[PDB]
């Protein structure tokens, strides 16, 4: 039967058939990696009375890849919370040797963007299962949530913190919990219990010795945050926002929020895919007074750029533009150097805040719900490149910012 | 686990909606439910 496919061949096949060498898909060319062990060593956390608590990573292993921040809380209301584990965390600053190297500022905002931009339906739904609790459960039910902090080294094991190579200083992150009684809306006068579990990798002596002794240079990502006031009126107003960013970036994300809850649209609800609830009509990026591209509509930034950059589009209110052709993998494939261009600008045109009862009497393409007048601010995030040099037991950044 | 548990909000239906068991709600609608 199928053998007919192999006899009826000719020159046309020369461009798809390989040589007599082992480049076939069978006779597997086996790859092998060294033996290792991993352990989740619990970290003690100092008291967090609505303040900063330091989490110090001790030398209980060779590499650390991820930090799991576990919070146990109880529901105090009939309102279903929206990522209450991420809303409770307000920021996390990671420092190496005392130098701050990575920051997540306005933390619930970045992690909701991160989840929508980076996580697939199974990973996205799972991340919700360990951060949200939404059955119609009674008030007072206690659940533990398992929040992974999206630090630069968590995405691929090979960039895990090379702690064995940092013999003269520690690594720590300062996590602050501002309040349970402000935005989640589920407070029950209950101080949540916070525990942190992190992993360690243990390598055998051949690589452990090589790794602890040799000089290393890791290309890492840094997160930069900016925000400003962004009101919207009943007419098509524009805004010209300075972009105070540095270093090569792969992409930038900007979003409009009602910073009272996790809502980026006038719908009053999360995950709205209807542009009738989103303000931005069009936007362009500008560098030193010269325009990078012709103004593209707001919907372009929420649904088209994501297809090439992520293979995944966020809900409306989250707008992304990429400079590289792949923004989730480890290899850099295109970036714009914000340290060489002196004046970076984001220019936004909005739709008119004139609409109401959107499902019935929404205008055609130039308006959005008047509820947009309750929006207060725009946040801009970008991921930049830097280099983590580890030499003679000390580490740090090559490019200071 | 996706779609087999319940919903958040705002189900738009272009066709019918058929149930076996019971429905727990009430509002204005078609010709009935208004007398």
């Amino acid at each position: 039967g199928a053998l007919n496919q192999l006899v009826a061949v000719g020159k046309q096949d020369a461009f798809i058939t390989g040589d007599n060498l082992d480049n076939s898909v069978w006779r597997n060319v086996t790859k092998k990696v060294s033996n290792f062990a991993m352990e989740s060593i619990e970290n003690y956390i100092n008291v967090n009375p609505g303040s900063t608590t330091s989490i110090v990573v001790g030398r209980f292993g060779d590499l650390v890849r991820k930090v799991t921040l576990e919070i146990t809380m109880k529901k105090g209301s009939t309102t279903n919370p929206f990522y209450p584990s991420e809303q409770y965390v307000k920021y996390a600053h990671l420092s190496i040797g005392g130098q701050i190297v990575y920051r997540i500022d306005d933390f619930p905002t970045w992690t909701r963007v991160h989840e929508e931009l980076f996580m697939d339906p199974d990973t996205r739904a799972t991340n919700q299962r360990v951060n949200n609790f939404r059955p119609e459960d009674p008030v007072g039910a206690i659940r533990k949530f398992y929040l992974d902090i999206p630090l630069f080294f968590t995405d691929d094991a090979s960039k895990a913190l090379p702690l064995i190579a940092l013999q003269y200083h520690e690594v720590k992150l300062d996590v602050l919990f501002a309040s349970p009684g402000d935005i989640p809306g589920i407070d029950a006068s209950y101080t949540p219990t916070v525990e942190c579990y992190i992993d360690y990798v243990f390598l055998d002596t051949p690589e452990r010795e090589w790794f602890a002794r040799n000089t290393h240079m890791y290309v890492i990502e840094q997160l930069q945050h900016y925000n400003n006031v962004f009101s919207v009126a009943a007419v098509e107003q524009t805004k010209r926002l300075n972009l105070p960013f540095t270093m090569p970036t792969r992409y930038l994300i900007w979003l409009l929020k009602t910073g009272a809850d996790g809502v980026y649209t006038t719908s009053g609800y999360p995950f709205e895919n209807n542009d009738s609830y989103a303000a931005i009509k069009s936007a362009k990026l500008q560098f030193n007074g010269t325009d990078r591209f012709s103004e593209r509509p707001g919907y372009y930034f929420t649904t088209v750029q994501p297809q090439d950059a992520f293979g995944r589009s966020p809900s409306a209110g989250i707008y992304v533009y990429s400079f590289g052709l792949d923004v989730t993998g480890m290899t850099s494939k295109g970036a714009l150097n914000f340290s060489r261009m002196d004046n970076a600008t984001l220019s936004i045109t909005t739709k008119a805040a004139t609409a109401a009862t959107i499902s019935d009497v929404y205008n055609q393409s130039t308006t959005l719900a008047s509820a947009i007048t309750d929006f207060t601010s725009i946040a801009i995030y970008a991921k930049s490149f830097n280099v983590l040099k580890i030499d003679y037991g000390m580490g740090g950044m090559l490019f200071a910012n | 686990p996706n779609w087999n548990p319940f919903f958040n909000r705002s189900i738009i239906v272009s066709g019918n909606l058929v149930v076996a068991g019971g429905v727990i709600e009430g509002n204005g609608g078609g010709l009935t439910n208004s007398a």
Binding site: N80, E136 | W3, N4, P5, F6, F7, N8, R9, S10, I11, I12, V13, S14, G15, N16, L17, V18, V19, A20, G21, G22, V23, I24, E25, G26, N27, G28, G29, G30, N33
Partner: peptide, 30 residues
């Protein structure tokens, strides 16, 4: 997908519901 809207044994909805037609027993308000 959202194109085989068939459920077994459970359902609850928070918001409002919109539809063309309907069926089932009645324990409704007003």
């Amino acid at each position: 997908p959202l194109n085989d809207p068939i459920m077994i044994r459970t359902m609850i909805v928070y918001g409002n519901l919109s539809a063309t037609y309907f069926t089932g027993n009645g324990a409704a308000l007003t």
